[PDB]
């Protein structure tokens, strides 16, 4: 008659934006449910397994998790494509895909076999390319590069001879400080500056690899089923709402912090990969997508949905948003 | 105790996207509250007053409404700025403004004095510039032009010599047909084609004047306060959610319908106002913004907040999203 659930999240405690999304979700559920369902959150400082969230929720040890789908590529490579993909969709496009273009259904197709329900957990919007010790001037500079980079982008850089890793949010600055890694990408101005990377890595590259990173709420299938229908709805709605508000917050904080970056950080050197490097990355991505499609029918089905939907909705984005933003004045 | 409410909407019945947003909200409230709060929706065919929604809600004749804030230009000029503004913010920028940048609070400053609570009610995304009988090649061509065009955009057109109006959704075609107006804007590919404008006015201009139209839920203050706190939250969350989903839906359907537009409506001729005309519209909007700000301290404050927040958030949009889109193609 009264439910007490626990949520495990990848992030350190009191982590802004990402931790706000899980917090906001839990507060809404309590408030809408007059306390019938309440959700206590354990961050990485507590459960000490930032990348164990999938297992926590699969087993039922936590009813819920907040994390990112593409962290679970080991469990199932198809988990990569429900977060974001290189050269993929923007957040408005991707939210359309999830809720109106078949994405939610495809995600369930992957996650049902684990007894996990996955839901969008909040979008960062467009991400940066990351923080580097040394500039990337040629493809050869990626060879043996120790870079923290998750998801399919990680796969792509491995294909080009890099040495990618997935170090979780709270340990990133330390890994770079000790030279465990020599480059990293995290998110963008909204979180990267308070996390301190610029102190060690002067070069801040523009992105390509995460155009709209969607985080993930995960729910144990049995816990969800243990709920009455009205609370089930409160839960799913609160997650969707928290996810959307996080994109709003990320956009807000990116505005605040790009501004700080263009005035309070004279030693940050904003850079873009040279075109020959982008062409090489683009080709490796396209080739690797083909490989992944050819080797599994479900992978092939997801990538075809992503590609097809992007082609349709991007034409509108180009026609509308992009043209609006590119508009100028002569004279 | 059970709460049985009514919502009045501006739109006709089974109106795609806009009407989906109000139904989604009502359905969410019913399901989350296990029937404790249910909301019957009355469309314009039933209450017969498409632009009577403000007064319906103010009076409490209806507990709620779904409409757009800039229709109430005549009851308070400041209501225009909580829908969208010419050369203004995109939807992701504006949601950030509403929820994290002070927009909600500013909107409440305006609506509180009418016993109404106003909330974001769904964004269309970027709108087209409208449907025209004749191409617009010079500023001159706007002079005398009778056009249906709402909100602050109408005021920019009037300043350049056009004659704006605001007719309800339902009689635009007829008004176009009987040469009452010679041009109009409505929304975009998601909703425009089914209205039939293209049969009479084949030139379809790209936009500038409604970069991110946010619809509006209104709630009677007394009605809102009659609710216990958990149903109040269910209600506010439902509106917020329905609003965000409508932007996702609008994006989806804009994509679907743009793809089909060339094939299925070969007589539509896509156009963009000439650069000298845009320069003039731009100057005109800049001028009117100053003029409107000088008339009223609250207006100046609303406009200063939008200007300031947009400057900050657009810098990001250009640095990130636009650069990314231009990086392909
Ligand atoms: Na990232
Ligand atoms: Na419009």
XYZ file of C-alpha atoms and ligand atoms in Angstrom:
662
model
C 0.000 0.000 0.000
C 3.123 2.122 0.397
C 6.231 1.507 -1.710
C 9.831 2.337 -0.860
C 12.150 1.953 -3.877
C 15.868 2.535 -4.303
C 17.554 4.075 -7.332
C 21.205 3.569 -8.159
C 22.940 6.098 -10.336
C 26.346 6.214 -11.996
C 27.207 9.771 -10.930
C 29.009 11.062 -7.892
C 26.845 12.585 -5.189
C 25.372 16.050 -5.670
C 26.256 15.921 -9.350
C 24.571 18.789 -11.123
C 22.155 18.309 -14.046
C 22.545 14.511 -14.282
C 21.933 14.061 -10.551
C 19.224 16.710 -10.751
C 17.334 14.591 -13.276
C 17.170 11.559 -10.909
C 16.359 13.834 -7.941
C 13.614 15.742 -9.843
C 12.052 12.487 -10.988
C 11.977 11.091 -7.418
C 10.503 14.316 -5.951
C 7.718 14.409 -8.556
C 6.817 10.761 -7.884
C 6.587 11.385 -4.130
C 4.626 14.581 -4.549
C 2.228 13.298 -7.185
C 1.686 10.053 -5.261
C 1.172 11.800 -1.895
C 3.968 9.634 -0.585
C 2.628 6.241 -1.738
C 5.752 5.746 -3.865
C 9.042 7.292 -2.785
C 12.469 6.669 -4.280
C 15.745 7.046 -2.391
C 18.820 7.601 -4.540
C 22.273 6.096 -4.050
C 25.067 7.716 -5.993
C 28.446 6.133 -6.709
C 29.890 7.213 -3.313
C 27.305 4.945 -1.726
C 26.995 1.758 -3.807
C 30.583 2.054 -5.131
C 29.771 0.592 -8.559
C 29.201 3.476 -11.004
C 29.139 1.035 -13.934
C 27.269 -1.715 -12.083
C 23.857 -0.088 -12.495
C 22.665 -2.483 -15.222
C 23.338 -5.468 -12.974
C 21.755 -3.761 -9.942
C 18.467 -3.326 -11.797
C 18.517 -6.642 -13.637
C 18.736 -8.522 -10.360
C 16.192 -6.350 -8.579
C 18.671 -5.295 -5.901
C 17.672 -1.754 -6.929
C 14.272 -1.171 -8.444
C 15.749 1.559 -10.625
C 18.844 3.098 -12.083
C 19.915 6.307 -13.786
C 22.838 5.878 -16.158
C 23.349 5.645 -19.919
C 22.424 2.835 -22.237
C 25.671 2.874 -24.182
C 27.652 1.936 -21.040
C 26.264 -1.641 -21.413
C 27.856 -2.468 -24.788
C 29.460 -5.502 -23.134
C 26.081 -6.928 -22.076
C 24.555 -6.214 -25.446
C 26.110 -4.137 -28.233
C 22.672 -2.905 -29.270
C 22.461 -0.832 -26.060
C 24.821 1.689 -27.730
C 22.289 3.052 -30.141
C 19.641 4.213 -27.670
C 21.917 6.891 -26.176
C 23.311 8.661 -29.254
C 25.461 7.832 -32.306
C 28.248 9.720 -34.116
C 26.892 12.057 -36.768
C 23.417 11.164 -35.533
C 20.289 13.061 -34.450
C 19.912 16.235 -32.414
C 17.856 16.030 -29.231
C 14.581 17.426 -30.769
C 14.954 14.932 -33.633
C 15.794 12.089 -31.292
C 12.907 12.768 -28.905
C 10.632 12.635 -31.976
C 12.184 9.319 -32.906
C 11.818 7.886 -29.403
C 8.205 8.850 -28.845
C 6.697 9.141 -32.352
C 9.169 7.389 -34.730
C 9.462 3.955 -33.141
C 12.504 4.316 -30.842
C 10.792 3.422 -27.583
C 9.525 0.193 -29.139
C 12.950 -0.704 -30.461
C 14.581 -0.051 -27.098
C 12.099 -2.335 -25.355
C 12.909 -5.000 -27.971
C 16.462 -4.949 -26.622
C 15.850 -4.502 -22.947
C 12.866 -6.919 -22.493
C 15.139 -9.965 -22.676
C 16.864 -8.729 -19.465
C 13.731 -7.943 -17.517
C 14.585 -4.239 -17.605
C 12.378 -1.403 -18.811
C 14.446 1.444 -20.260
C 13.245 5.032 -20.588
C 14.868 8.243 -21.793
C 16.612 9.751 -18.795
C 17.632 13.223 -19.978
C 19.409 14.784 -22.948
C 22.606 16.802 -22.811
C 22.116 18.287 -26.249
C 25.171 18.639 -28.509
C 28.416 17.591 -26.851
C 31.965 18.802 -27.323
C 34.776 16.657 -28.767
C 36.712 16.551 -25.503
C 39.842 17.693 -23.682
C 43.317 16.930 -25.084
C 46.882 17.307 -23.901
C 48.153 17.552 -27.462
C 46.460 18.727 -30.662
C 45.181 16.243 -33.219
C 46.556 17.335 -36.597
C 46.531 14.071 -38.530
C 44.904 10.619 -38.316
C 48.285 9.279 -37.155
C 47.878 11.339 -33.937
C 44.940 9.053 -32.980
C 47.118 5.956 -33.061
C 47.586 4.637 -29.559
C 45.754 7.640 -28.117
C 44.514 6.747 -24.598
C 41.168 8.447 -24.637
C 38.172 8.134 -22.368
C 35.271 7.940 -24.880
C 32.153 5.737 -24.512
C 29.686 4.090 -26.830
C 29.914 3.640 -30.552
C 32.341 6.604 -30.903
C 34.703 4.615 -28.753
C 34.368 1.720 -31.187
C 35.095 4.022 -34.104
C 38.286 5.479 -32.569
C 39.437 1.933 -31.738
C 39.045 1.123 -35.414
C 41.388 4.026 -36.204
C 44.016 2.684 -33.811
C 43.133 4.586 -30.674
C 42.933 2.996 -27.227
C 39.543 4.028 -25.808
C 38.277 3.487 -22.292
C 35.068 4.161 -20.307
C 36.067 5.737 -17.044
C 33.009 6.887 -15.176
C 32.175 10.494 -14.451
C 33.540 10.779 -10.889
C 36.988 9.318 -11.686
C 37.689 11.252 -14.898
C 39.724 14.188 -13.663
C 41.946 11.858 -11.627
C 42.515 9.481 -14.586
C 43.715 12.433 -16.693
C 45.894 13.861 -13.890
C 47.770 10.542 -13.469
C 48.243 10.041 -17.244
C 46.059 6.938 -17.186
C 44.453 8.698 -20.112
C 45.759 11.538 -22.304
C 42.431 12.777 -23.590
C 38.794 12.541 -22.636
C 35.353 13.671 -23.645
C 32.669 14.210 -21.044
C 29.810 16.566 -22.042
C 30.308 20.283 -22.758
C 30.504 23.634 -20.938
C 27.477 22.753 -18.821
C 29.573 20.246 -16.803
C 33.174 20.173 -18.106
C 34.383 23.418 -16.523
C 33.381 22.742 -12.952
C 35.044 19.346 -13.320
C 38.429 20.943 -13.929
C 39.811 19.305 -17.116
C 41.071 22.614 -18.500
C 43.689 22.691 -15.724
C 45.523 19.763 -17.331
C 44.317 19.696 -20.922
C 44.476 22.985 -22.788
C 42.767 21.901 -25.989
C 38.970 21.784 -26.135
C 37.680 20.246 -29.344
C 34.297 20.782 -30.960
C 32.168 17.643 -31.301
C 30.759 15.105 -33.728
C 30.557 11.957 -31.596
C 27.574 12.758 -29.306
C 25.109 15.136 -30.946
C 22.364 14.340 -28.439
C 23.303 12.059 -25.577
C 20.188 10.661 -23.915
C 20.627 9.256 -20.475
C 18.536 6.339 -19.238
C 16.150 5.519 -16.409
C 16.031 1.761 -15.918
C 13.273 -0.091 -14.019
C 13.292 -3.691 -12.855
C 10.443 -5.380 -14.701
C 9.192 -7.115 -11.571
C 9.150 -3.965 -9.453
C 7.252 -2.118 -12.187
C 4.737 -4.960 -12.338
C 4.369 -4.842 -8.532
C 2.860 -1.382 -8.841
C -0.806 -0.386 -9.311
C -1.715 1.289 -12.621
C -2.026 4.844 -11.278
C 1.461 4.763 -9.683
C 2.900 3.075 -12.770
C 1.752 6.087 -14.741
C 3.066 8.562 -12.235
C 6.413 6.779 -12.499
C 6.595 6.765 -16.323
C 5.368 10.318 -16.632
C 7.837 11.567 -13.988
C 10.699 9.963 -15.840
C 9.662 11.476 -19.186
C 9.260 14.913 -17.547
C 12.547 14.745 -15.729
C 14.270 13.718 -18.986
C 12.819 16.624 -20.967
C 13.625 19.139 -18.164
C 17.216 17.943 -18.173
C 17.600 18.975 -21.802
C 16.168 22.323 -20.781
C 18.627 22.528 -17.908
C 21.550 21.449 -20.057
C 20.681 24.122 -22.612
C 20.419 26.701 -19.842
C 23.741 25.691 -18.265
C 25.503 25.535 -21.607
C 24.476 29.132 -22.227
C 25.716 30.162 -18.784
C 28.996 28.311 -19.135
C 29.912 29.046 -22.771
C 29.717 32.676 -21.666
C 32.063 32.048 -18.726
C 34.357 30.119 -21.118
C 34.684 33.050 -23.532
C 35.843 35.389 -20.769
C 37.145 33.582 -17.631
C 39.304 30.871 -19.303
C 42.035 32.549 -21.374
C 44.115 29.378 -21.436
C 41.436 27.223 -23.075
C 42.242 26.700 -26.758
C 39.137 25.768 -28.716
C 39.984 23.576 -31.678
C 38.338 21.500 -34.379
C 39.723 18.306 -35.963
C 41.143 18.997 -39.488
C 38.860 17.908 -42.343
C 41.097 15.017 -43.353
C 40.710 13.665 -39.816
C 36.923 14.188 -39.927
C 36.670 12.435 -43.277
C 38.622 9.488 -41.881
C 36.357 9.364 -38.830
C 33.245 9.663 -40.954
C 34.372 6.793 -43.184
C 35.304 4.568 -40.232
C 31.911 5.183 -38.616
C 30.013 4.335 -41.822
C 32.115 1.224 -42.416
C 31.731 0.121 -38.791
C 27.957 0.680 -38.914
C 27.816 -1.599 -41.953
C 29.784 -4.245 -40.058
C 27.479 -4.067 -37.101
C 24.395 -4.263 -39.339
C 25.665 -7.246 -41.353
C 26.505 -9.256 -38.234
C 23.113 -9.174 -36.378
C 19.552 -8.720 -37.669
C 18.372 -6.691 -34.712
C 21.417 -4.343 -34.977
C 20.567 -4.006 -38.647
C 16.956 -3.147 -37.738
C 17.898 -0.423 -35.223
C 20.519 1.226 -37.449
C 18.090 1.244 -40.381
C 15.407 2.948 -38.222
C 17.948 5.594 -36.963
C 19.280 6.266 -40.476
C 15.880 6.449 -42.134
C 14.273 8.585 -39.461
C 17.275 10.941 -39.376
C 17.139 11.453 -43.128
C 13.476 12.454 -42.856
C 13.558 14.679 -39.796
C 16.977 16.255 -40.560
C 15.569 17.622 -43.833
C 13.063 19.540 -41.756
C 15.731 20.685 -39.303
C 17.848 21.908 -42.232
C 14.855 23.597 -43.906
C 13.583 25.245 -40.804
C 15.890 25.664 -37.756
C 19.224 25.773 -39.619
C 17.974 28.273 -42.224
C 16.508 30.432 -39.465
C 19.749 30.440 -37.541
C 21.877 31.115 -40.641
C 19.724 34.133 -41.587
C 21.694 37.432 -41.608
C 21.616 41.111 -42.675
C 23.386 42.821 -45.565
C 24.039 46.578 -45.701
C -14.114 13.620 -3.109
C -13.936 13.772 -6.909
C -13.109 16.699 -9.148
C -14.880 16.955 -12.473
C -13.527 19.789 -14.562
C -13.912 21.220 -18.068
C -11.333 22.662 -20.410
C -12.180 24.998 -23.314
C -9.851 24.928 -26.282
C -9.530 27.280 -29.234
C -9.152 24.403 -31.724
C -11.829 22.508 -33.566
C -12.559 18.937 -32.475
C -10.036 16.158 -33.289
C -7.526 18.843 -34.323
C -4.167 17.128 -34.871
C -1.219 17.946 -32.568
C -2.808 20.935 -30.791
C -5.889 18.887 -29.836
C -3.660 15.906 -29.101
C -1.801 18.019 -26.568
C -4.969 18.869 -24.572
C -6.250 15.257 -24.789
C -2.853 13.868 -23.713
C -2.862 16.153 -20.710
C -6.431 15.248 -19.716
C -5.732 11.549 -20.183
C -2.561 11.723 -18.106
C -4.359 13.512 -15.273
C -7.148 10.931 -15.245
C -4.773 7.958 -15.230
C -2.307 9.285 -12.659
C -5.037 10.358 -10.258
C -7.002 7.160 -10.707
C -10.039 9.205 -11.780
C -9.979 11.665 -8.881
C -9.458 14.498 -11.365
C -11.029 14.171 -14.787
C -11.181 16.908 -17.408
C -13.832 17.029 -20.159
C -12.561 18.963 -23.220
C -14.867 21.275 -25.159
C -13.689 22.323 -28.606
C -14.724 25.456 -30.444
C -17.619 23.723 -32.175
C -19.191 23.117 -28.776
C -18.572 26.349 -26.810
C -18.678 28.450 -30.027
C -16.077 30.956 -28.838
C -12.631 30.080 -30.176
C -11.161 33.323 -28.831
C -13.312 33.389 -25.705
C -10.979 31.095 -23.747
C -9.359 33.804 -21.513
C -12.726 35.051 -20.215
C -14.063 31.476 -19.813
C -11.139 30.663 -17.527
C -10.997 34.043 -15.778
C -14.685 33.724 -14.893
C -14.381 30.076 -13.897
C -17.110 29.029 -16.321
C -14.330 26.630 -17.391
C -11.609 25.475 -14.968
C -9.115 25.311 -17.813
C -8.232 26.327 -21.273
C -5.839 25.459 -24.079
C -4.987 28.303 -26.424
C -2.179 30.771 -27.100
C -1.055 33.644 -24.901
C -0.609 36.127 -27.769
C -4.333 35.963 -28.726
C -4.958 38.138 -25.618
C -3.002 41.064 -27.046
C -6.111 43.229 -26.548
C -6.585 42.393 -22.885
C -2.898 42.959 -22.137
C -0.137 43.693 -24.659
C 2.409 41.756 -22.598
C 0.628 38.452 -23.304
C 2.265 38.415 -26.729
C 5.729 37.725 -25.422
C 4.920 34.407 -23.721
C 4.104 32.647 -26.997
C 7.049 33.575 -29.237
C 8.658 36.738 -30.704
C 9.935 37.592 -34.201
C 13.656 36.742 -34.549
C 13.247 35.217 -31.121
C 14.276 31.956 -29.464
C 13.974 28.411 -30.772
C 11.926 25.913 -28.706
C 14.894 24.333 -26.777
C 16.107 27.853 -25.962
C 12.678 29.008 -24.890
C 11.961 25.974 -22.676
C 15.268 26.725 -20.994
C 14.097 30.360 -20.653
C 10.678 29.317 -19.211
C 11.869 26.737 -16.722
C 15.432 27.894 -15.861
C 15.754 31.491 -17.098
C 12.905 33.326 -15.383
C 10.185 32.979 -18.019
C 7.548 31.204 -15.923
C 7.934 33.797 -13.175
C 7.588 36.671 -15.659
C 4.495 35.037 -17.177
C 2.922 34.739 -13.709
C 3.649 38.431 -13.079
C 1.448 39.118 -16.081
C -1.340 36.552 -15.538
C -1.739 36.668 -11.722
C -3.703 39.903 -11.906
C -6.444 38.148 -13.891
C -6.918 35.189 -11.551
C -5.307 32.886 -14.136
C -2.402 30.501 -13.998
C -0.654 30.176 -17.351
C 1.648 27.300 -18.390
C 3.512 26.248 -21.542
C 1.054 24.207 -23.609
C 3.154 22.809 -26.437
C 5.646 24.138 -28.956
C 5.239 23.933 -32.742
C 8.894 24.536 -33.441
C 9.885 26.894 -36.244
C 6.932 28.168 -38.274
C 6.689 29.160 -41.948
C 6.206 32.778 -43.027
C 2.840 32.017 -44.540
C 0.806 31.608 -47.680
C 0.650 34.296 -50.322
C -1.349 34.993 -53.491
C 1.519 37.090 -54.916
C 5.252 37.014 -54.258
C 6.695 39.718 -51.992
C 9.717 41.232 -53.765
C 9.963 44.657 -52.162
C 8.914 46.347 -48.944
C 6.333 48.150 -51.091
C 4.471 44.861 -51.739
C 3.583 44.693 -48.006
C 1.904 48.058 -48.053
C -1.816 47.591 -47.770
C -1.456 43.798 -47.600
C -4.370 42.334 -45.638
C -2.849 39.419 -43.753
C -3.903 37.117 -40.930
C -0.869 37.179 -38.637
C -1.065 37.153 -34.784
C 1.057 38.556 -31.948
C 4.091 40.817 -32.133
C 4.660 39.793 -35.767
C 1.423 41.490 -36.771
C 2.678 44.689 -35.120
C 5.920 44.520 -37.149
C 3.922 44.095 -40.355
C 1.598 46.964 -39.458
C 4.619 49.238 -38.894
C 5.788 48.475 -42.450
C 2.370 49.342 -43.915
C 0.513 46.011 -43.972
C -2.955 45.562 -42.402
C -2.862 42.642 -39.955
C -5.788 40.755 -38.474
C -6.390 37.682 -36.276
C -9.157 35.361 -37.420
C -9.814 32.055 -35.666
C -8.345 28.865 -37.082
C -11.675 27.821 -38.597
C -12.452 30.531 -41.178
C -9.009 31.315 -42.655
C -9.673 29.413 -45.856
C -13.102 30.939 -46.347
C -11.654 34.404 -45.611
C -8.934 33.767 -48.178
C -11.559 32.507 -50.595
C -13.841 35.524 -50.282
C -10.845 37.881 -50.669
C -11.231 39.220 -47.122
C -7.493 38.648 -46.648
C -4.871 38.212 -49.355
C -2.370 36.335 -47.186
C -1.949 34.520 -43.906
C 0.276 32.413 -41.726
C -0.872 29.474 -39.670
C 1.855 26.975 -38.627
C 3.948 24.913 -41.038
C 4.037 21.664 -42.971
C 2.691 19.706 -39.916
C -0.739 21.387 -40.171
C -0.884 23.787 -43.123
C -1.604 21.539 -46.056
C -4.775 19.972 -44.744
C -6.295 23.514 -44.470
C -6.231 23.984 -48.231
C -4.537 27.381 -48.431
C -2.321 26.157 -51.252
C -5.331 26.012 -53.628
C -5.697 29.798 -53.533
C -2.352 31.106 -52.330
C 0.458 29.007 -53.784
C 3.507 30.924 -52.552
C 4.738 29.388 -49.258
C 7.240 31.613 -47.506
C 9.845 30.542 -45.012
C 9.547 32.125 -41.621
C 11.083 34.576 -39.196
C 8.101 35.709 -37.188
C 7.273 32.584 -35.116
C 10.501 30.668 -34.430
C 8.956 28.758 -31.503
C 5.228 29.209 -30.843
C 4.439 27.937 -27.367
C 0.752 27.191 -26.813
C -0.840 27.832 -23.456
C -2.739 26.009 -20.744
C -4.720 28.309 -18.480
C -6.107 27.323 -15.081
C -8.591 29.333 -13.034
C -6.817 30.288 -9.773
C -9.797 29.445 -7.576
C -10.166 26.114 -9.336
C -6.485 25.349 -8.951
C -6.629 26.170 -5.259
C -9.611 23.850 -4.681
C -7.378 20.946 -5.487
C -5.332 19.116 -2.885
C -1.556 19.313 -3.265
C -0.971 15.904 -4.894
C -3.626 16.542 -7.610
C -2.210 20.048 -8.100
C 1.172 18.480 -8.875
C -0.310 15.774 -11.097
C -1.942 18.585 -13.036
C 1.145 20.768 -13.426
C 3.315 17.809 -14.367
C 0.755 16.632 -16.904
C 0.685 20.020 -18.619
C 4.441 20.284 -18.719
C 4.736 16.759 -20.157
C 1.977 17.265 -22.746
C 3.653 20.507 -23.834
C 7.098 18.899 -24.311
C 5.526 15.936 -26.230
C 3.762 18.282 -28.556
C 7.131 19.757 -29.657
C 8.324 16.182 -30.250
C 5.093 15.496 -32.202
C 5.383 18.699 -34.183
C 8.944 17.808 -35.127
C 7.868 14.300 -36.153
C 5.019 15.544 -38.318
C 6.939 18.403 -39.852
C 9.430 15.778 -41.011
C 6.693 13.499 -42.391
C 4.868 16.270 -44.199
C 7.873 18.120 -45.629
C 9.003 14.923 -47.312
C 5.657 14.528 -49.003
C 5.112 18.226 -49.824
C 6.864 18.343 -53.236
C 5.269 15.093 -54.420
C 1.758 15.642 -53.179
C 1.376 19.401 -53.692
C 3.355 20.281 -56.862
C 1.603 23.622 -57.172
C 3.176 24.895 -53.903
C 6.011 27.320 -54.589
C 8.426 27.688 -51.676
C 9.883 31.228 -51.369
C 11.968 33.368 -48.975
C 11.543 37.098 -48.649
C 14.327 38.966 -50.504
C 17.270 40.049 -48.302
C 16.401 43.759 -48.591
C 12.923 42.932 -47.278
C 14.395 40.928 -44.348
C 16.742 43.848 -43.572
C 13.634 46.081 -43.405
C 11.627 43.659 -41.260
C 14.625 43.240 -38.947
C 15.056 47.023 -38.475
C 11.300 47.362 -38.027
C 11.252 44.734 -35.261
C 14.250 46.337 -33.550
C 12.459 49.695 -33.672
C 9.128 48.404 -32.343
C 10.795 46.572 -29.492
C 12.267 49.881 -28.320
C 8.961 51.628 -28.829
C 7.033 49.014 -26.860
C 9.585 48.986 -24.097
C 9.342 52.771 -23.727
C 5.553 52.575 -23.113
C 5.524 50.434 -20.007
C 8.060 49.417 -17.370
C 6.789 45.807 -17.254
C 7.045 45.555 -21.035
C 10.638 46.830 -20.902
C 11.427 44.225 -18.255
C 9.909 41.305 -20.191
C 11.753 42.385 -23.332
C 15.019 42.928 -21.517
C 14.814 39.391 -20.056
C 14.088 37.817 -23.463
C 16.837 39.840 -25.145
C 19.390 39.025 -22.463
C 18.568 35.356 -22.148
C 18.352 34.818 -25.919
C 21.797 36.471 -26.422
C 23.301 34.033 -23.955
C 21.571 30.827 -25.061
C 21.791 31.546 -28.822
C 25.563 31.831 -28.509
C 25.513 28.154 -27.483
C 23.023 27.158 -30.188
C 25.237 28.698 -32.829
C 28.499 27.334 -31.307
C 27.100 23.816 -30.939
C 23.914 22.936 -32.854
C 24.359 25.181 -35.933
C 28.035 24.274 -36.300
C 27.134 20.605 -36.045
C 24.403 20.847 -38.678
C 26.689 22.801 -40.993
C 29.506 20.272 -40.513
C 27.850 17.624 -42.779
C 25.883 17.701 -45.263
Na 30.038 12.155 -23.490
Na 1.291 30.917 -36.425
